[PDB]
Amino acid sequence: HRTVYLFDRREKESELGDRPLQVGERSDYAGFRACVCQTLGISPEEKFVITTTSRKEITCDNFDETVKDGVTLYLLQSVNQLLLTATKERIDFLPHYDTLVKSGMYEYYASEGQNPLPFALAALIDNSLSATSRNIGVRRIQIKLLFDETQGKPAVAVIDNGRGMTSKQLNNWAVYRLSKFTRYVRPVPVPRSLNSDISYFGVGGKQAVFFVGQSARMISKPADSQDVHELVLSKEDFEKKEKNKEAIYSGYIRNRKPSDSVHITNDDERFLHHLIIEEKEKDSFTAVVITGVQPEHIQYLKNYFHLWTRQLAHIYHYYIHGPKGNEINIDIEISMFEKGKVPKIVNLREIQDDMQTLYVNTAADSFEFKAHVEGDGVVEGIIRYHPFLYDRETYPDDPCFPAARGKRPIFECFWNGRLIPYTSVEDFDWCTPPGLAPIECYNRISGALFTNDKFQVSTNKLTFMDLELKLKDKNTLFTRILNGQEQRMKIDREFALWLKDCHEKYDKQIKFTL
Amino acid sequence: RTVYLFDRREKESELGDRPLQVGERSDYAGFRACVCQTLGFVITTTSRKEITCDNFDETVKDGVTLYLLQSVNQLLLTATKERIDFLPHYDTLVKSGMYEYYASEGQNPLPFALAALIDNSLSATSRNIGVRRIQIKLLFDETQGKPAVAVIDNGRGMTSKQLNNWAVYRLSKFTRRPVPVPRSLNSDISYFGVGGKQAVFFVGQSARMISKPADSQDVHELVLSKEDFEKKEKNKEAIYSGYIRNRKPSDSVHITNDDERFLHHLIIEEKEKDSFTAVVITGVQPEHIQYLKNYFHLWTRQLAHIYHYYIHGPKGNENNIDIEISMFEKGKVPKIVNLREIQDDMQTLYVNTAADSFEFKAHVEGDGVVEGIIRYHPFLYDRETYPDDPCFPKAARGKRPIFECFWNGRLIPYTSVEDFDWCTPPGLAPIECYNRISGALFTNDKFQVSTNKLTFMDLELKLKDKNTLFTRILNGQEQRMKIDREFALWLKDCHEKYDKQI
Ligand SMILES: Nc1ncnc2c1ncn2[C@@H]1O[C@H](COP(=O)(O)OP(=O)(O)OP(=O)(O)O)[C@@H](O)[C@H]1O
Ligand SMILES: Nc1ncnc2c1ncn2[C@@H]1O[C@H](COP(=O)(O)OP(=O)(O)OP(=O)(O)O)[C@@H](O)[C@H]1O
Ligand SMILES: [Mg+2]
Ligand SMILES: [Mg+2]
């Protein structure tokens, strides 16, 4: 049985409403037309016509190809009669499954001399940070690059010991654009907004997995749950469901006891048996297993291991090292496996040449402030002084920007504690050179800005929407943070005086002639 | 009301599930009795919450999966399969443009949303015989109802089926290729199946699509709106089901609220058109209205810049496309401009202050070819003529990048290329001549852009790749010279010919 919707539009006064019509398999136009004449009281002496909404007339030849399930049909005196009264033609407009499969394909663009693949990994780290935010003890977040072909096909796995997901929460995860606002306890403010409350849009994890690869296997277990819940979303399963005319967004969660990998029969996915065996220890976990990894991603992760782990340490510097930075707990552990090589392992806390560590440890002093923007948003700011010592500047180098800072921007920008990589602020009026402090001192300052969600970011969290615009608005008030207290100030003069004091206390102009 | 029951008492229990039809008026004991009868403990949800008559109605709903177990916390001997639906949330549409148009390089990004709708009209009018009329009407006169933004073209329009397709997020031309032309001004700008929906839901909260093909006697009208999605959700109706209204041209009887008064004057004009599409955005955010009202000359120049080469052709502003903008305010004269009238958009300034040009192609391994042009702006007696750029308030170009970048003929606003090696100062030509050159790069779709079409994905990285071959185009033939010395020579000639001291 397939339903069609018939509008009688022979005369203006014809019934406004449509008449639905159940049509069984292997029926013909003559049968269809007879029923119409009978129910509606129409002599088979009327020369009326039946047309689609495009005015294509139904005939015996085209009946089966034209009268499909769901179509709307017109009863007309003639094929091109004037539509005296308006019709309502039912439609379905379900999003195409590429809403998921292509959600990350054209989002992570390259900018400022950076490879964006680690930003997809950061999206998954963000999820694990939120999931581990109330852990008693260690918050463990592992990224395993299973690129050893003696264990199966390449796979990227992100595993944490967070709170995990129920069947329902795992169902929610699969819903594109289902966020914490739609499916929530807004956290109490905290310095640098290191609150682990990084989610906003309900899409980031899906963009990441389908950017990295073509199939995601979610494995999760809350502490309360006896059972492990497992859900696969993949390009292959959508294509299969399309070809077989099955519901595109229907599937099933596999519930199972911990450590049971009997459902893994693909030898390509061998490595999953060992991942699933590891579940016995864990009271609560989530594992994101990505397969169908694009070859260009694998080659970058193999050949630039020190660079892209550094990028991640840079992004999560203040989550790793706390609000003061790495003045030289969360364990973010990367491990990569290749045929013929010892496992490569690094805890991001080990990394010492990420840009923030260099800024923090080459700084002689700092200048701390807040910016109060119209709309009640508050930005935390820090400026750091990197002094000239005898014969050299100490402002650290940045490989993306091959006398001290140069033409580089002063400020890196952080949102809920993590770096937003493609938004920098060059300077403000009050920290550019006009004077009361020597000009070259304005080139010795680096900085960081910290917001919470009051300042919007783009969906991919690569950029702020309008951070600089709001900070430089005429109504924005700047305050100084000193000894824990916040106070209004005359910032142009008070920053200059701070800069002059830094020059006199820290800059050293003594050198043996060459 | 169907539930799916898994018998999981023993390791040998039946693997498959047994669907049970639980009537609407049924009890826990009744249900329990039906279970004992059908198969031969406790019953739980998939979270091991035990079914009781206290929770029976809040727990045994249509479509749920249930467990038959010896105890609540018995280990699962055999794995179950729990049916789920995961339809995208309707914010997949309503919020599709809310966090996509970020500000960069001092530009307000609102006109980029209008460019997305212009791109659609360029493609819809690509085979028009005669004029291609693309109108943007800002109906901000409150005597005619609430604010609205309308984009109206005289293109091919949409059938009922094509209008249905337009409402499918991510339904593209690939899941439903012109011949190469200069600067890829091919009007084949679509790719992703989302741009138009991001634009309307960035600008406002409701989109009325009105369309009519020439081969169609009826007009097709479809509304997508935040308010409609919210009503369907409240009433538990299918989220992605609606209807297309089909009507005769110029019939506006369905418009009954005074706040949409303006639509009568808009629909009356359908008499005059064989084919058309009208996008009508309502629920316009107040901040978009304020910007559009107070910076008319700025944001219309932005659109002329973006579409310079579609307006003026492949040589620039030294065609049958009429992009007309009109804004209506209470007690004011209509503001009206054809983008072809604008003369101080950046590309016009580059084209007209240029004394000579240097043309070239970049061949990127993988069949991708980029067309490029560099323009020389001389020093005339006592000033540089390199045009100023309000986004950027070495005396000529200064720190600005050389190259603006175009994709299928239209500007990509947030992708610039500062320079290449062969056109950066080393001296076969005075150093300061290298600061007097602007340029533009043109690609087709062989070079990827992001979904919102604000940036290229990896244009600069591929252009600077060591395998990339740079060839000059002189007259109409490809010359095989070493571009770097060829360009330094061209820059000497330009200096010795166009720079003036007296
Ligand atoms: N590692 C995890 N542990 C527990 N729950 C998770 C994990 N990853 C994802 N989820 C759940 O799935 C949901 C969807 O995640 P996704 O990253 O797609 O969107 P989001 O994080 O909510 O928003 P955003 O788009 O800002 O990332 C999350 O809100 C979270 O509840
Ligand atoms: N003004 C118009 N006239 C005729 N058809 C249109 C018009 N606007 C949109 N369409 C149809 O609706 C479809 C969806 O448009 P939308 O802009 O959402 O995606 P797209 O243009 O296909 O891809 P992209 O995301 O690259 O813009 C278009 O492909 C086109 O077929
Ligand atoms: Mg997320
Ligand atoms: Mg489009």
Residue numbers in the entry:
A (entry chain A): 25 to 207, 218 to 362, 373 to 446, 464 to 495, 499 to 578
B (entry chain B): 26 to 65, 72 to 207, 220 to 361, 372 to 446, 463 to 495, 499 to 574
How did the manuscript describe this experimental structure?
Structural maintenance of chromosomes hinge-domain containing protein 1 (SMCHD1), an emerging player in the field of epigenetics, is a unique member of the GHKL superfamily. Originally identified in a mutagenesis screen for novel epigenetic repressors of repeat sequences, SMCHD1 is now known to not only silence repeats but also a subset of autosomal genes, particularly those that are imprinted, mono-allelically expressed, or clustered, and to maintain X-chromosome inactivation. SMCHD1 is a 2005aa protein with an N-terminal functional GHKL-ATPase module (1–578aa), an extended non-conserved middle region of unknown function, and a C-terminal SMC-hinge domain (1616–1963aa) that mediates constitutive dimerization. Herein, we have revealed the crystal structure of the SMCHD1 N-terminal module which contains all of the conserved elements of the Bergerat ATP-binding fold, a transducer domain, and a novel ubiquitin-like (UBL) fold.
The crystal structure of the GHKL-ATPase module in the presence of ATP was solved at 2.2 Å by expressing a construct consisting of residues 24–580 with a E147A inactivating variant. The asymmetric unit contains two dimers which adopt similar conformations (RMSD of 0.71 Å over 972 Cαs). Each monomer is comprised of three domains: a pre-N terminal domain with a ubiquitin-like fold (UBL) (25–109aa), a GHKL-ATPase catalytic domain (110–395aa), and a transducer domain (396–578aa). ATP bound to the active site is stabilized by interactions with residues from each of these motifs and by an octahedrally coordinated Mg2+ ion that forms interactions with oxygens from each of the three phosphate groups of ATP and with the conserved Asn151 from Motif I on α-helix 4. The proposed catalytic base, Glu147 (mutated to Ala in the crystal structure to inhibit ATP hydrolysis), is also located within Motif I on the same central α-helix as Asn151. In the SMCHD1 crystal structure, the ATP lid exists in a closed conformation and is located between Motif II and Motif III and extends into Motif III. A loop between β-strand 17 and α-helix 15, termed the “switch-loop”, extends from the central domain structure along the dimer interface and positions Lys525 at the ATP binding site for a hydrogen bond with the γ-phosphate. The SMCHD1(24–580/E147A) construct forms the canonical GHKL-ATPase dimer with an N-terminal β-strand (110–120aa) “strap” that is swapped between monomers. One unique feature of the N-terminal domain swap in SMCHD1 compared with other GHKL-ATPases is the addition of a UBL domain. SMCHD1 N-terminal dimerization generates a cavity between the transducer domains of the two monomers that is flanked on both sides by a disordered loop (447–463aa).
